[PDB]
């Protein structure tokens, strides 16, 4: 079953200097990203330390989660976890 929400992940421990473009590029090596939400604080204009990205393929999520979790980017260890995220538009 491809049409599950197992294509969605939670990214935590975001660097304040990481934007959707950074994530998209990185996440693209693990597969095809279709949507990404960078949670950014309206007050500071900077990242809230977490983000979301969903893939076209569920296998891509495991590729990303297992490889990115614990990996240090921007001097900080990324935390990736599988979650069903439902975006607000």
């Amino acid at each position: 079953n491809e049409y599950k929400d197992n294509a969605y992940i939670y990214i935590g421990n975001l660097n304040r200097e990481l934007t959707e473009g950074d994530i998209l590029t990185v996440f693209s090596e693990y597969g095809v990203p279709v949507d990404v939400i960078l949670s950014r604080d309206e007050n500071t204009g900077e990242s809230q330390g977490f983000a979301y990205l969903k893939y076209e393929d569920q296998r891509s999520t495991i590729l990303a989660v297992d490889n990115l979790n614990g990996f240090k980017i921007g001097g900080r260890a990324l935390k990736i976890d599988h979650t069903f995220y439902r975006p607000k538009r």
Binding site: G21, S28, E29, V32, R59, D66, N67, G70, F71
Partner: protein, 35 residues
């Protein structure tokens, strides 16, 4: 992790790879030299 999914279009020659610890381990093999 050795999957057969082809990379997305936003990918630019950025390689983020796990198993960094093994690489460190592989070179820390030394007993007298740099760890």
């Amino acid at each position: 992790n050795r999957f057969a999914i082809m990379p997305g279009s936003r990918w630019d020659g950025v390689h983020r790879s796990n198993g960094f610890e093994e690489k460190w381990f592989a070179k820390q093999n030394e007993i007298n030299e740099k760890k």
